[PDB]
Amino acid sequence: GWDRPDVPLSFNPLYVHKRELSIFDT
Amino acid sequence: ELFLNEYRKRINNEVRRAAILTPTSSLREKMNHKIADQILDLSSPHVRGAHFQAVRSWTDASK
Amino acid sequence: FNSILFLLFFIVNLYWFNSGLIFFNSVYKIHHDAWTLIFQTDSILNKLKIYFFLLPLYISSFIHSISTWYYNYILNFLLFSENLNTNTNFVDYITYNTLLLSKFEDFNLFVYIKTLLITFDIRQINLDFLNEYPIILLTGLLFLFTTIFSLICLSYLGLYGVFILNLASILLFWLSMLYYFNLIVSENYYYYISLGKWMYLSNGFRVSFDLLIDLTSISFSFLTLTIGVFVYIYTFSYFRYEPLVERLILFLNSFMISMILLVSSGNFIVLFLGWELIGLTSFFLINFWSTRVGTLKAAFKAFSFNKLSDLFLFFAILIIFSTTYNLDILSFNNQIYLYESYNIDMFYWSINLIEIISFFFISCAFIKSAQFGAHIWLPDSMEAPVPASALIHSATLVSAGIYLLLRLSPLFELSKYAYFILPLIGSVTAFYGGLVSAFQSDTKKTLAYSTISHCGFLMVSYSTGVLEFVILYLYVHGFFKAATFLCVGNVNRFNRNIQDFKRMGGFYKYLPFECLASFVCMINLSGLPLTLGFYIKHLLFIGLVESYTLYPLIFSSLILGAIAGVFYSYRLFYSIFFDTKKGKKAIYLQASRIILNSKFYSNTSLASNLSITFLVLISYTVILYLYCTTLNNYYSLSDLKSIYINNAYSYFYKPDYNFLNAVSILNWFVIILLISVIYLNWRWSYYYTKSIDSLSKFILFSFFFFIFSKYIL
Amino acid sequence: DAYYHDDTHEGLMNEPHGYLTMDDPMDLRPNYEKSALELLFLVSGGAILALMLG
Amino acid sequence: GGFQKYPIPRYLHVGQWIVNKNWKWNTFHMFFPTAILCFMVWRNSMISTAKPPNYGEYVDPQSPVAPKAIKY
Amino acid sequence: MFNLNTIYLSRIFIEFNFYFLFFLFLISSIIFYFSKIISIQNLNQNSVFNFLKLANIFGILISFFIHIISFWFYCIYSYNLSLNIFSDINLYNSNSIELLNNSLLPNYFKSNITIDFFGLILLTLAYIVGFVSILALDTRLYWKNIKYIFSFTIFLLIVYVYVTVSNILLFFMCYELLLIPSFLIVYFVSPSRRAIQASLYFVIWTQLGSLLVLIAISYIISITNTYEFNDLKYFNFTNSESTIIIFLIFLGFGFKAPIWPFHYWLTKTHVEAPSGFSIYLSGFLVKTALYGFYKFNTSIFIDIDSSIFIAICIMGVVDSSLKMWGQTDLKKLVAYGTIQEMNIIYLAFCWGDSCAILGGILFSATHAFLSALMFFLVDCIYRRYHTRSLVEVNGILHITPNLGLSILFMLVFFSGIPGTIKFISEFYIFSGLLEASPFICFILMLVANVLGLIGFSKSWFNATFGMPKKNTKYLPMDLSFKESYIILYCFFFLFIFSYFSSIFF
Amino acid sequence: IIGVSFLARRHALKVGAPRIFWSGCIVGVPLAAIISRGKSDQLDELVGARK
Amino acid sequence: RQNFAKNITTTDIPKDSHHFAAKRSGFTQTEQAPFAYNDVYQYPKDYKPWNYNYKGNGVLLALFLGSAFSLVAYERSYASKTGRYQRKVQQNYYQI
Numbered sequence A: 001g002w003d004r005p006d007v008p009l010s011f012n013p014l015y016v017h018k019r020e021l022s023i024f025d026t
Numbered sequence B: 001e002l003f004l005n006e007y008r009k010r011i012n013n014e015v016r017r018a019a020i021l022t023p024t025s026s027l028r029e030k031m032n033h034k035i036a037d038q039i040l041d042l043s044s045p046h047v048r049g050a051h052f053q054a055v056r057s058w059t060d061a062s063k
Numbered sequence C: 001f002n003s004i005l006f007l008l009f010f011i012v013n014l015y016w017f018n019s020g021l022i023f024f025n026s027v028y029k030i031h032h033d034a035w036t037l038i039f040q041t042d043s044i045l046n047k048l049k050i051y052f053f054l055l056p057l058y059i060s061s062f063i064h065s066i067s068t069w070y071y072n073y074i075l076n077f078l079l080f081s082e083n084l085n086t087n088t089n090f091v092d093y094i095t096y097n098t099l100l101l102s103k104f105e106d107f108n109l110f111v112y113i114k115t116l117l118i119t120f121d122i123r124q125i126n127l128d129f130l131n132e133y134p135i136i137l138l139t140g141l142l143f144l145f146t147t148i149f150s151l152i153c154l155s156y157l158g159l160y161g162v163f164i165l166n167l168a169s170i171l172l173f174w175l176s177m178l179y180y181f182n183l184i185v186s187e188n189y190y191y192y193i194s195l196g197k198w199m200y201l202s203n204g205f206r207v208s209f210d211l212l213i214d215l216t217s218i219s220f221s222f223l224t225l226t227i228g229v230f231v232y233i234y235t236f237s238y239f240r241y242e243p244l245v246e247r248l249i250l251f252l253n254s255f256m257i258s259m260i261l262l263v264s265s266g267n268f269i270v271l272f273l274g275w276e277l278i279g280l281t282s283f284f285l286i287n288f289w290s291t292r293v294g295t296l297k298a299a300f301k302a303f304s305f306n307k308l309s310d311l312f313l314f315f316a317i318l319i320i321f322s323t324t325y326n327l328d329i330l331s332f333n334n335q336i337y338l339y340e341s342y343n344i345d346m347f348y349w350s351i352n353l354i355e356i357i358s359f360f361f362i363s364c365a366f367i368k369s370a371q372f373g374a375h376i377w378l379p380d381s382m383e384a385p386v387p388a389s390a391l392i393h394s395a396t397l398v399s400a401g402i403y404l405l406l407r408l409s410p411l412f413e414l415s416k417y418a419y420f421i422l423p424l425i426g427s428v429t430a431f432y433g434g435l436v437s438a439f440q441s442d443t444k445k446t447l448a449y450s451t452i453s454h455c456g457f458l459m460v461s462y463s464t465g466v467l468e469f470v471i472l473y474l475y476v477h478g479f480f481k482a483a484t485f486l487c488v489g490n491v492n493r494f495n496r497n498i499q500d501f502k503r504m505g506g507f508y509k510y511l512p513f514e515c516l517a518s519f520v521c522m523i524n525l526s527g528l529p530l531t532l533g534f535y536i537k538h539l540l541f542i543g544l545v546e547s548y549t550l551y552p553l554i555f556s557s558l559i560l561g562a563i564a565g566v567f568y569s570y571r572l573f574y575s576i577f578f579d580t581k582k583g584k585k586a587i588y589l590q591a592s593r594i595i596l597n598s599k600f601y602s603n604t605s606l607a608s609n610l611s612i613t614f615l616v617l618i619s620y621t622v623i624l625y626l627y628c629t630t631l632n633n634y635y636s637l638s639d640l641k642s643i644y645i646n647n648a649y650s651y652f653y654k655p656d657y658n659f660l661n662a663v664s665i666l667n668w669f670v671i672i673l674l675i676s677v678i679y680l681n682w683r684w685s686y687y688y689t690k691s692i693d694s695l696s697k698f699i700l701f702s703f704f705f706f707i708f709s710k711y712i713l
Numbered sequence D: 001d002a003y004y005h006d007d008t009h010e011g012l013m014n015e016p017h018g019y020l021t022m023d024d025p026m027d028l029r030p031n032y033e034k035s036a037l038e039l040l041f042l043v044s045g046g047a048i049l050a051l052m053l054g
Numbered sequence E: 001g002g003f004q005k006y007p008i009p010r011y012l013h014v015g016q017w018i019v020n021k022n023w024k025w026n027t028f029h030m031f032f033p034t035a036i037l038c039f040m041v042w043r044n045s046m047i048s049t050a051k052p053p054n055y056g057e058y059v060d061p062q063s064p065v066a067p068k069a070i071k072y
Numbered sequence F: 001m002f003n004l005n006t007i008y009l010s011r012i013f014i015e016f017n018f019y020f021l022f023f024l025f026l027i028s029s030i031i032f033y034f035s036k037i038i039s040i041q042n043l044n045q046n047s048v049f050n051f052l053k054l055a056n057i058f059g060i061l062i063s064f065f066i067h068i069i070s071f072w073f074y075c076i077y078s079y080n081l082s083l084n085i086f087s088d089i090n091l092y093n094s095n096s097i098e099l100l101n102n103s104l105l106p107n108y109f110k111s112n113i114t115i116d117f118f119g120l121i122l123l124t125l126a127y128i129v130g131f132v133s134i135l136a137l138d139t140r141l142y143w144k145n146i147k148y149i150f151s152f153t154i155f156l157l158i159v160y161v162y163v164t165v166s167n168i169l170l171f172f173m174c175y176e177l178l179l180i181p182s183f184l185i186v187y188f189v190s191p192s193r194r195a196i197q198a199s200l201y202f203v204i205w206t207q208l209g210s211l212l213v214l215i216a217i218s219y220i221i222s223i224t225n226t227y228e229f230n231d232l233k234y235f236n237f238t239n240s241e242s243t244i245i246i247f248l249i250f251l252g253f254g255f256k257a258p259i260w261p262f263h264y265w266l267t268k269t270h271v272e273a274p275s276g277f278s279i280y281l282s283g284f285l286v287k288t289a290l291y292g293f294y295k296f297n298t299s300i301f302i303d304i305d306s307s308i309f310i311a312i313c314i315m316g317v318v319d320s321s322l323k324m325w326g327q328t329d330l331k332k333l334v335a336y337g338t339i340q341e342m343n344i345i346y347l348a349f350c351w352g353d354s355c356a357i358l359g360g361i362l363f364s365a366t367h368a369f370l371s372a373l374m375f376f377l378v379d380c381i382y383r384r385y386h387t388r389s390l391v392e393v394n395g396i397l398h399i400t401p402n403l404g405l406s407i408l409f410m411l412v413f414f415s416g417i418p419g420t421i422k423f424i425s426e427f428y429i430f431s432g433l434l435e436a437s438p439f440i441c442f443i444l445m446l447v448a449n450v451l452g453l454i455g456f457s458k459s460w461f462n463a464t465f466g467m468p469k470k471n472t473k474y475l476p477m478d479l480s481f482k483e484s485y486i487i488l489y490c491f492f493f494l495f496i497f498s499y500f501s502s503i504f505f
Numbered sequence G: 001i002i003g004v005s006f007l008a009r010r011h012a013l014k015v016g017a018p019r020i021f022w023s024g025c026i027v028g029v030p031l032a033a034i035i036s037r038g039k040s041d042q043l044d045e046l047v048g049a050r051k
Numbered sequence H: 001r002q003n004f005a006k007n008i009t010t011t012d013i014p015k016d017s018h019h020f021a022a023k024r025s026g027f028t029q030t031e032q033a034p035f036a037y038n039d040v041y042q043y044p045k046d047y048k049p050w051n052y053n054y055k056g057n058g059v060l061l062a063l064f065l066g067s068a069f070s071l072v073a074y075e076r077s078y079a080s081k082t083g084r085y086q087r088k089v090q091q092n093y094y095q096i
Ligand SMILES: CCCCCCCCCCCCCCCCCC(=O)OC[C@H](COP(=O)([O-])OCC(O)COP(=O)([O-])OC[C@@H](COC(=O)CCCCCCCCCCCCCCCCC)OC(=O)CCCCCCCCCCCCCCCCC)OC(=O)CCCCCCCCCCCCCCCCC
Pocket: C149, C152, C153, D020, D041, D042, D044, D045, D048, D049, D053, E037, E038, E040, E041, F402, F405, F406, F409, F479, F483, F484, F485, F487, F488, F492, F496, G017, G018, G019, G020, G021, G023, G024, G025, G027, G028, G029, G031, G032, G035, H050, H051, H052, H053, H054, H055, H056, H057, H058, H059, H060, H063
């Protein structure tokens, strides 16, 4: 019924790094 | 060495032929003959199937 | 320059040439060597008459001579070889060959044209020719090439193009497989085909690419192909309106062909190839949702286990090759008994050769069949779409170990390790899977754990050692597991990808076909009295051996696993369909709108319903055929190529009072469990007192009915 | 289904599209890397056919 | 049932919701040539196919077809 | 039916292909030097750089075709020579056929050419890998390093003399000549700044082994004044001399062909070297050492236990396989894979001249092609996605489907599926090792094909799959025709070389 | 096979359909003949008539 | 960067000069000057970017001729191995 807006880019949310990627967790 | 390996390959092919031609009944009875003895006699010590080296003394190489 | 005139002249020339050919043939027969005396007579009038009346023959011979001269020149030019037989000059050669007419001695134009026409005649093909030469290869190659080329050319073949092409190929393959299934299973027909010398594997060795279509191969091949046909028909509806339906369809076809190649393998190299191919294609199917990395973790888990199994299988094959300088399956099966007495000198222990080879084979078989310990990947493999899950868990991925055991049975018959390990692990897996499935709440997880339990039962059946019982169990489990998987897939699609039935309730009306189809499929799958699936468990308990040291644990685990079927079947069916409505209001309201009321109304696909119905019908027919072949008084199964007789059929033909009364214990255990799952109340209801009253009525009526039936008549 | 949209009317059904490779269809460079690799493939195949097969 | 359709870039050669108008002729010209190739492969392989004797046939042990042991 | 025409055609083709390459190189170099006062590119469409690129590419390619023909002639010649020697049993008859040299071109370095199957396999690897690497280095050569367009032609000439000579000293000199061009390429063509230190590490690590091999050659030459490589049959080295020679030879050639612990230089150089030169290094430059080790150890009689050398090779395999998991850098991961494969190949040569050499040669060929494929894929990833790290690269398949498909098929080939020369080589080596020492064979197979394989596959699968939501304005398009056909040719060779005549394998 | 493949390949080109499969048929007819003739000529005794 | 010449003489570049039009009247005192070159690339109709768009028979003919040459060469080779000027076809051929 309703004309839905095109699928949101929000469906895939960009992930922003906030913590160091330790080399001990490679 | 390749010729002995060829003997082993030929006897294996003959065993496959026997398996296909002869039903499982009497198959072992007919195999317990020249064929089985040759299969055992062509074992690894006598034929170098896939081993890196066939450990042969100079007398064995001459033979 | 008229087409009609050209055609008329051509027809006249044809008739004239045919008449001249007949005349020359007759004259040549009369004058075998003296025909020249009249043909090449020095008389000018006779020479002119002969040339005029045989002009079509003479012009044809001239054209043939020119063509032969040019062809010989081309061959000499290309091959730097010899001359045109001799060094005849062009003029001498052409004159001699044109004057020579003996080339037409046995040639008749009408006969030649008729032979060319009848060459392609299809009336000639006969069953006897098909029986001599298997057309299974022609259709399997068709299916394989169709899948490969469809994968490559996706843009050319849209959704509909891919579907129709692969549907045609798979239907032809299945029909041919169906035709040869009757001959292979009962008529003692099996084929050994070779495509060529594949690779060199030693200084002078070269293994050929060979296929073995035997009873052992066909049992798995026909089951996988029959399940795959309907899974293929069903997938186009399950993945309806999805971005990537062609990819899923082609992945399913790839996995099917990989499993078919594995089962119908003529030597260990082809077997290993098929092993790796099923592993890789199962990985792709599990990782179908490539965008998500959560799916990649399950795919990588399955990949690691598959690589471990590949290591074990490769090492076992290497041991076999080192012992016997041969990789042929038949040769190995018929030779292993000679080398049974041998031992292998390892690091610090002298291990028995049969024991070590069987150890590696059983390890890889357990990993791929999801036995206890190595089953951790199977629950996580449910991330795949339901068609892929059904195909892998019914008869394609989880039966690879069973196929290995059946194909190399002569090896394991002389294996102490196999004797000790197969029953114990099989029973433990059966119990574990059954109980976990009973306590499970998700549909796909429940089916996965039920698959684990049935694989354990298959291992225990092989331990008993009746290959016919193992094959029957495999067929029953595969067919009904696949059907139940399809039904739960429809249920999940309706419920919007929520696979837990805690949010499912009152779906009987919204999915009428699924409810009844699931009822039938589940009663058959879970071994229940008066169903096609009761006999498999009955035969397993008939054949179970009693000389084991851990027999107490084995038998108790088997009993618990066998009874566990009832709980999971009841929970799944009741909670999905006839329980109180637990799902979100939207699921029901979106479909209850009056505007939708129509002759076309349905929450599933008509093609899906037809596919499930045909799958159930064909499974019933095939299971009945196998039961008649094996369990009938007249044994008409084809040779299994095994010399180990277990004596288990004695308790199926002439059971004694002890065993007859022993089976009653399990029968009544199942009866009590059914009564519990039916009449037991866990929640307050308006019908609590009336439910207790109904239980009392049923008990008393059962007693009186038994009294009248046995004594009063 | 209830409200299925036909392909002829669905504006988001895609016909075959996209560029097979990164090479520009209309390129003015006399580039020969593709020709060199095609020649390598063809000569290898021809050598197999004319020297090795059979 | 399925996910909502979203635009796909034209430049990208991907299979998302790809439908071909000429799929009928494409299928016709992809099926029959494949069938001919498989027929050629099948007739080539049939030369190296093995089958056990029929119902009324027995293998004579002294016939050439019968298996023969290696003669040293 | 074999005739002298085939013999002379084989010899003439082998001799004249070298002079074809040399004359092409000489003409190209003369043009380059005498066309410009300063030998650098003129940044215009009419530069001589285009002509030099054309000449190098289609000299290598045409010489590769001629090498195919000459290799086939050699195969026929060697097979029929063995038949001629073996067939005749009469005591009066003996095969003594003497060939007279042509009067057109001279014998380079006054040496009679001798060709073997391993040498020609090495030469074919040189041709193909050099072609791939030159195709890769086009974007790297610009306006001051154009002089390095001839590096692969120089490599081809050096390798040709290396594999078509029966002289020990010329053999050693050809082996040692490879250092300068490779060092210059790494030093002047590598974009990364760490390449400066990587080049020094490469030079020092390889030169230590070169000095070891030099000491061994000095021992052989000083003791035996001969140089014909066949007079060693009539001279026997004492036990001490033989053990010293084998130790020096093994260690020196293992410095080049990476062995544990001498692979630090290899990792550094592969990480910091041009993506186009890493292909050539891994594919070919580590196998000249294997060829030299094979020649020397099969010529010398050694009466020592090879357990220590086998242990070194197995330790290298285990070390590389265990470290595969912890690499997020695709290039370093491929370098560890190269170390593993090279150590397996080297292990294949630890039983003198036994049948293990066949598996070693086949594994050398398959590793060359597989490493070329892997490094080329890494090159494509790095060039279109401006990073070769797993953390920065994800979801390649969804933006570049062809590249993701190439990665997946590369992993499948690396896994060693049947129908591939990789599988055939693994089968040879493991079949021998099972009888040699079954428990060691089990440990090696387990580690390499499970733990190392899983570590290798983790990073590649993580890169291929996922969802590339980052930097949507800078995403690349796809593989080009050049890259696609290179990948296809690598796959085609890996698949079809299994049909090569089994006489030599 | 060759004639029908040529005609069908022409039709596929006309209607814009794939034709590399018809090309494969045409190319492989001689190759299939070579393989079959070589297999027949080889003195290899599979299960069947002895040489 | 690239230094090749765009304007080739082997053929005339396909183009459309009507898609973009340059303004030539009615300007304002704040509007930028128009552009001189406004031709766009025009592809041939029926060009499909998703395949090779190859319509030649050269490759097929080359492969078929190579296969035919290989067949005839093998025939001659077999005759030479058997020591005959031509193959001696037998009356019956069996499986093998
Ligand atoms: C984009 C690519 C990206 C690559 C990089 C990424 C790589 C990794 C990821 C891979 C996955 C992603 C890429 C895949 C998607 C690509 C999408 C795409 O581009 O779509 C367009 C692409 C091209 O079609 P199109 O663009 O519409 O039109 C192209 C032209 O119109 C066609 O013009 P034409 O009609 O004139 O045809 C020209 C010619 C095609 O010309 C060539 O390709 C030149 C080949 C030179 C030789 C090189 C070695 C070949 C080795 C065998 C493989 C043959 C090639 C087939 C492809 C590989 C296998 C799948 O066609 C033929 O004649 C075919 C015959 C070839 C046989 C040659 C054999 C040489 C000797 C080999 C060794 C000895 C064999 C003994 C056998 C004995 C008997 C069994 O889509 C396809 O059509 C796919 C075709 C796939 C192959 C099947 C068809 C050929 C079958 C040949 C015979 C074998 C079958 C059984 C025969 C049985 C009897 C013997």
